[PDB]
Design a protein around this ligand. Sequence first.
Ligand SMILES: *[C@@H]1O[C@H](CO)[C@@H](O)[C@H](O)[C@H]1NC(C)=O
Ligand SMILES: *[C@@H]1O[C@H](CO)[C@@H](O)[C@H](O)[C@H]1NC(C)=O
Ligand SMILES: *[C@@H]1O[C@H](CO)[C@@H](O)[C@H](O)[C@H]1NC(C)=O
Ligand SMILES: *[C@@H]1O[C@H](CO)[C@@H](O)[C@H](O)[C@H]1NC(C)=O
Ligand SMILES: *[C@@H]1O[C@H](CO)[C@@H](O)[C@H](O)[C@H]1NC(C)=O
Ligand SMILES: *[C@@H]1O[C@H](CO)[C@@H](O)[C@H](O)[C@H]1NC(C)=O
Ligand SMILES: *[C@@H]1O[C@H](CO)[C@@H](O)[C@H](O)[C@H]1NC(C)=O
Ligand SMILES: *[C@@H]1O[C@H](CO)[C@@H](O)[C@H](O)[C@H]1NC(C)=O
Ligand SMILES: *[C@@H]1O[C@H](CO)[C@@H](O)[C@H](O)[C@H]1NC(C)=O
Ligand SMILES: *[C@@H]1O[C@H](CO)[C@@H](O)[C@H](O)[C@H]1NC(C)=O
Ligand SMILES: *[C@@H]1O[C@H](CO)[C@@H](O)[C@H](O)[C@H]1NC(C)=O
Ligand SMILES: *[C@@H]1O[C@H](CO)[C@@H](O)[C@H](O)[C@H]1NC(C)=O
Lengths: 341, 224, 210
Amino acid sequence: WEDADTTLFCASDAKAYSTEKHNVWATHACVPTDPDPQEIPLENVTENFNMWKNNMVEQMHEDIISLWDESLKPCVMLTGGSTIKQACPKVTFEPIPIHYCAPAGFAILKCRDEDFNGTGPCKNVSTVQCTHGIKPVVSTQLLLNGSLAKGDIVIRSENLTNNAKVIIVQLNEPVQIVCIRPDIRQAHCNVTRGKWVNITKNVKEQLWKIFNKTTNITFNNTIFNSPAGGDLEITTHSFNCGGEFFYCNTSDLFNETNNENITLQCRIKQIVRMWQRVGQAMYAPPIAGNITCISNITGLLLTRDGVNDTHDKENETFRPTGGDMRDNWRSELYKYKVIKL
Amino acid sequence: RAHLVQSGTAMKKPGASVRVSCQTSGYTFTAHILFWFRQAPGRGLEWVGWIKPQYGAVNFGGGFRDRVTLTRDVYREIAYMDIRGLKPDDTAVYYCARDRSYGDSSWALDAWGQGTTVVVSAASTKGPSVFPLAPSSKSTSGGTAALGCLVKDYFPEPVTVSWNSGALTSGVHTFPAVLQSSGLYSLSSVVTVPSSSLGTQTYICNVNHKPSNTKVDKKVEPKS
Amino acid sequence: YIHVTQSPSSLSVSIGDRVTINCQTSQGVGSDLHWYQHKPGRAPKLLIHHTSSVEDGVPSRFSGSGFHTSFNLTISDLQADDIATYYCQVLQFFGRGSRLHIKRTVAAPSVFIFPPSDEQLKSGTASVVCLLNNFYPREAKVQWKVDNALQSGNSQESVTEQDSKDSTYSLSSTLTLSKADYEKHKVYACEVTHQGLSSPVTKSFNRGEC
Ligand SMILES: *[C@@H]1O[C@H](CO)[C@@H](O)[C@H](O)[C@H]1NC(C)=O
Ligand SMILES: *[C@@H]1O[C@H](CO)[C@@H](O)[C@H](O)[C@H]1NC(C)=O
Ligand SMILES: *[C@@H]1O[C@H](CO)[C@@H](O)[C@H](O)[C@H]1NC(C)=O
Ligand SMILES: *[C@@H]1O[C@H](CO)[C@@H](O)[C@H](O)[C@H]1NC(C)=O
Ligand SMILES: *[C@@H]1O[C@H](CO)[C@@H](O)[C@H](O)[C@H]1NC(C)=O
Ligand SMILES: *[C@@H]1O[C@H](CO)[C@@H](O)[C@H](O)[C@H]1NC(C)=O
Ligand SMILES: *[C@@H]1O[C@H](CO)[C@@H](O)[C@H](O)[C@H]1NC(C)=O
Ligand SMILES: *[C@@H]1O[C@H](CO)[C@@H](O)[C@H](O)[C@H]1NC(C)=O
Ligand SMILES: *[C@@H]1O[C@H](CO)[C@@H](O)[C@H](O)[C@H]1NC(C)=O
Ligand SMILES: *[C@@H]1O[C@H](CO)[C@@H](O)[C@H](O)[C@H]1NC(C)=O
Ligand SMILES: *[C@@H]1O[C@H](CO)[C@@H](O)[C@H](O)[C@H]1NC(C)=O
Ligand SMILES: *[C@@H]1O[C@H](CO)[C@@H](O)[C@H](O)[C@H]1NC(C)=O
């Protein structure tokens, strides 16, 4: 069995009667999930996986694009020199777990090695016909509704010395975030101060451990800070909830100066800058009522500041980032890879 | 195919601000990181920061974060670099370069802007003084004499020097301009000629300083 | 921080020679090493990306090699277009460069000295110019003496680029003095030391006389 990238197909637990858009797309593009999913282990054998050059990430990317294309239709869309006007009805939008499976003659290799940084050899290796249930959550800064690491916090980067390589963080304890909108564009999220400082404490120390172990970059203390620039989609924690686009200020989350919870002032926008293509999409005004989303902060997207020449200092600054939704997919597709029989 | 065009040279005072533009063309603008490098005179290239033009995510090298702003315009496919609080140490040639990989970061820069010279000086625009470098008998060297022109006390670069309205080119040497301690530049342009032609051929150096609209024709003769 | 060291700093080359310059890194790099060509007045040009992969458009003579902490750029058959500076890069760390010039036979300079003009003296300052014309190699040493008093820190040297015709260099050293200090001394000498000279050449003059 040799490595290959074939033509995967999707499978989900979507319902035929559901009006929600993820269920509607998955009903016509996918199949019913495996009632008894087999996972045959492969003992006395090891093999290497690479999450950063995985074609499974690219397939999930363009599927979520076509999902967003036919689901969240904007009123006016500006792409290139063309203006695309279309109907923009208010829809119900909530992601569901999606499984990716290998066609006839192929299989998927799953690595069950605990504390796996994304690359290198794997002792625990099993074969599955499908992945696990992955919610295609499109978020920024904070990875929501993802999977948790069984051991400590795991730090993933294709090259930790490259400051352009975004660092994908995967938490071990979920940080519950409660966003709500009772100005019909003013919302706010609430997050417990105790659990966020505790998780931040464990993430800072894990960043220090992985840089002291695998990198020649040495620093005494780890420090966070708000992003230095960019569009509002990445300078804030941007996500989708009930069809509306939320832009939440995370300055309080990444403020070093540290009572119950932490309140993040949000803002719903009608004009967003799309992630699936280059252009802006104008959506309809928000719907009335109490719009509430309770999600799990399961991961972080961070970039490291450029080092000073001939300097190191006791402090290294990390900042939340986002934009490329491929990193959101490989935060779950890291353990899987396609094999050919 | 990929082309990067920058803005012209910048004349600035210590403490002022400068904007350098970087127009891109011939490729998907938002799919390649744009890096900004500078090269001080006599030093190597140093990284100041990059930008991911999709959403404008940026990063900077140590020190530049305090006063450099990297931006871009996605519709017009043009990146910008703003530098505030200029110091004389920031006098350098600034480049904007494109990463060769599509949607990745390999730091391999295949497409480069032509460069933008930024000079941060307290001095003000001044035209040069053109003094002769007479042949005499110390420059004859028994056969071939040497005369020249001293273009002294001007700002800023550059100065165009020719001889005999461009007719005299053989044996001409115009040296790179040097920055005096006063903040003004000065260069010399010399030419070696046969000693016998000193009393027959009129040798005139033609100095041009566009920043001051100064044009000078200095006739060089052996001194009395 | 990654230190990048190139060697040699400057190298003498002949048309059609096999050239090899080295790049060193302070730590294990692996493969993502890139080489660039830089000619004066133009932007740097990417030659090799990722140790040995040659960029499209680069001539076939170029080839990269190396591993871990030592990398080499190789030119199989040098031509006139290949005379430039060459950097090696890793992440945001560029090397200081290796400069290439044409090698020729050693040639001594023709030393001249110019006293300041009366027009400049009427302005208030005096510039004594000493000229070193058509010498090789580039390295030379110019010494200013005023009444056998050694001058240091009040002169400036400007050396032209390597000539295209005869592959020689030219250097001008200017001594800047006030009118008062200039008129207080008589002998102004210029002592040139160069490989092509068995003994140092001295071109001097007397103020006002000849
Ligand atoms: C890894 O393999 C061992 C034995 O091969 C097994 O006991 C263990 O459950 C495996 N780990 C996971 C996470 O399945
Ligand atoms: C990931 O783990 C493998 C196996 O130990 C190691 O070779 C590789 O360098 C690690 N990657 C990073 C970015 O530390
Ligand atoms: C969040 O995590 C908790 C475990 O503490 C789990 O019970 C809950 O179902 C999760 N919610 C979501 C939306 O994933
Ligand atoms: C913390 O946030 C929750 C969000 O549901 C809220 O109900 C609670 O009152 C907050 N704690 C306070 C206000 O002390
Ligand atoms: C969020 O927390 C703030 C402060 O703890 C509180 O005043 C507010 O009521 C909370 N949100 C909701 C919806 O209760
Ligand atoms: C976030 O809030 C801080 C103050 O709490 C403010 O300075 C900053 O500009 C805000 N950023 C955004 C993107 O709203
Ligand atoms: C962090 O909080 C302090 C006080 O709570 C505030 O002065 C500072 O501006 C904050 N930093 C930001 C918003 O980046
Ligand atoms: C996470 O899942 C919960 C329930 O499964 C849902 O209400 C919430 O909107 C999801 N979060 C996002 C960002 O989609
Ligand atoms: C870290 O702290 C120790 C002592 O607290 C000090 O000796 C060391 O130099 C520090 N590291 C850096 C990079 O400054
Ligand atoms: C750190 O650098 C040293 C040499 O400076 C090298 O020997 C070592 O392998 C490097 N370690 C890592 C993890 O890069
Ligand atoms: C990241 O890349 C640098 C430069 O090639 C290299 O020195 C370092 O070892 C790499 N990191 C890992 C974990 O391989
Ligand atoms: C590069 O060339 C030099 C001299 O030709 C040689 O000493 C060195 O070993 C070469 N590098 C490698 C990696 O072979």
